[PDB]
């Protein structure tokens, strides 16, 4: 009679919370989805071994089209778990699944876990100063979306930081690197000429958040555009005007050039 | 030989990540602070039992003034952990403590935990639509803080949602309720008269996120300002322009007035 949305965390199988793990172990059936994102630091097998239950993976169609036919039926006479990378419901479409549960007469509970949305706090930048977020999507064919560029402009104009989620082709396990994102942004700038993203723009790259050894680098596009930030996933941030304390952290912890203390503060 | 920043999570001792627990259990010394937030579902004893170590609790003064004299010295010859509610680097100044660690020759690592900043996803509102965040602080003496009012105004003008962290006076066991936050906002409104926060403003309240049964309520200030949302902690949200799906969730899950379904595109 109960459905549990359980978050898996940032990177590997140990990023789930103790609460999530224990609940998952007591569920009769355990489902999971890896289309909204991937758990780059582990494998389905390792997650299964930790939970001690076989995990049935669901595709985007399985969920968006048949959630009420695949998952909910079992939740009627059993405790069912639905695992998702990060924190449940941080992905825009999963909240509606709670409504589906309701109309099916199934109780649902959410077990939270760390999300890159909150993990960016490790960049040393004040979380309250992050504005609207955006996703840098790979262009394709005659389609060249650029709304993420406008988001940076609007945030920066108000002295706010911009968190940029990078595109991912989960099915094919293809990660967009911060380098590719920087190249795309420069391309958009050349098209729009808004003076929003250039070689002189200060950016911050956070790679493999959740890991004990994430890569945290800060600096100007001209210097970081071809730098190796390690394996995915990568997150890109365009800070607004920095608080001195934010800048000091980027310099001392993220290897930012001393120049940011007088140019970006 | 190292210092660990480990989050404890939203509500109880099981909100710590498996990663955080396994590491905490192997540290030689464990410190913690419980003034940045409130974990309403646990106690020091239960946390100690789970980790199997004695925990020395530090006050805001111990940390901000003497972190390098109380914690860092031991981290030079031992494995030390510093525990905090939620995520250690979200809506705190703990990030700066990493700078102190570096300058003291101590390597530090961060272990994330669920944060209220991302947990708001359970309100059904799109995470990317949250703009700048703010804190509603208790007036003191002749001092009446009001900056949070301007944050709401700036976000709303952009159609963005506003997350409002509520004040806390740990040593006095005072946890600002959503009701008190609403009362303060109405007073600021009377002064600035910007039409930002009135009895007709739609707001969302999330209390005790992390628990299995958090209170999630949406409605007009006039109706919710005297409603009982249960024990603290609470956070207040002022939605911007709602998506249909956002409104649908608030109605179905948060008991919001069905009239908000009719969006004024
Ligand atoms: N479980 C919870 N439910 C509702 N609000 C919460 C909460 N935990 C924290 N808050 C809110 O955030 C304030 C503390 S701010 C510190 C937040 C913490 N680093 C984190 O990552 O969550 C509280 O006063 C309250 O307004």
Curated annotation (Swiss-Prot), chains A, B:
Keyword Lyase applies: no
Sorted UniProt keywords: Methyltransferase, S-adenosyl-L-methionine, Transferase
Pfam families: TP_methylase
GO biological process: methylation; protein histidyl modification to diphthamide
Domain of life: Archaea
Pathway annotation: Protein modification; peptidyl-diphthamide biosynthesis
Chain residues that bind S-adenosyl-L-methionine: 10, 87, 90, 115-116, 166, 209, 234
Reactions mediated catalytically: 2-[(3S)-amino-3-carboxypropyl]-L-histidyl-[translation elongation factor 2] + 3 S-adenosyl-L-methionine = diphthine-[translation elongation factor 2] + 3 S-adenosyl-L-homocysteine + 3 H(+)
GO molecular function: diphthine synthase activity
EC number of this enzyme: 2.1.1.98
Keyword check for Acetylation: no
Something else known: The diphthine intermediate is not stable in vitro and readily eliminates the trimethylamino group. It is not known whether the elimination reaction also occurs physiologically.
Main function: S-adenosyl-L-methionine-dependent methyltransferase that catalyzes the trimethylation of the amino group of the modified target histidine residue in translation elongation factor 2 (EF-2), to form an intermediate called diphthine. The three successive methylation reactions represent the second step of diphthamide biosynthesis.
Family: Belongs to the diphthine synthase family.
Subunit-structure text: Homodimer.
Name by which UniProt lists this protein: Diphthine synthase
Organism expressing this protein natively: Pyrococcus horikoshii (strain ATCC 700860 / DSM 12428 / JCM 9974 / NBRC 100139 / OT-3)
């Amino acid at each position: 009679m109960v459905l549990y949305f359980i978050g898996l965390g940032l990177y590997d199988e140990r990023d789930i919370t103790v609460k999530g793990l224990e609940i998952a172990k007591k569920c009769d059936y355990v489902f999971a989805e890896f289309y909204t994102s991937l758990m780059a630091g582990t494998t389905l097998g390792r997650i299964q071994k930790l939970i001690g239950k076989e995990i049935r993976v669901l595709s985007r169609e399985d969920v968006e089209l048949n959630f009420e036919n695949i998952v909910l039926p079992l939740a009627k006479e059993n405790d069912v778990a639905f695992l998702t990378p990060g924190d449940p419901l941080v992905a825009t479409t999963h909240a509606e699944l709670r409504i589906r549960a309701k109309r099916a007469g199934v109780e649902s509970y959410v077990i939270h876990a760390p999300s890159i949305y909150s993990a960016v706090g490790i960049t040393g930048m004040h979380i309250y100063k992050f504005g609207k977020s955006a996703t840098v999507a790979y262009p394709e064919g005659n389609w060249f979306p650029t709304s993420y560029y406008d988001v940076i402009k609007e945030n920066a104009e108000r002295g706010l930081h911009t968190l940029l989620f990078l595109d991912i082709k989960a099915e094919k396990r293809m990660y967009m690197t911060a380098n590719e994102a920087m190249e795309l942004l420069l391309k958009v700038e050349d098209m729009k000429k808004g003076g929003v993203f250039t070689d002189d723009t200060l950016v911050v790259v956070l790679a493999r958040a959740g890991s004990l050894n994430p890569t945290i680098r800060a600096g100007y596009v001209k210097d970081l555009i071809r730098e190796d930030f390690g394996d995915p996933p990568h997150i890109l941030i365009v800070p607004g005007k920095l608080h001195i304390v934010e800048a000091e952290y980027l310099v001392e912890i993220a290897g930012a050039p001393r120049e940011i203390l007088r140019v970006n503060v």
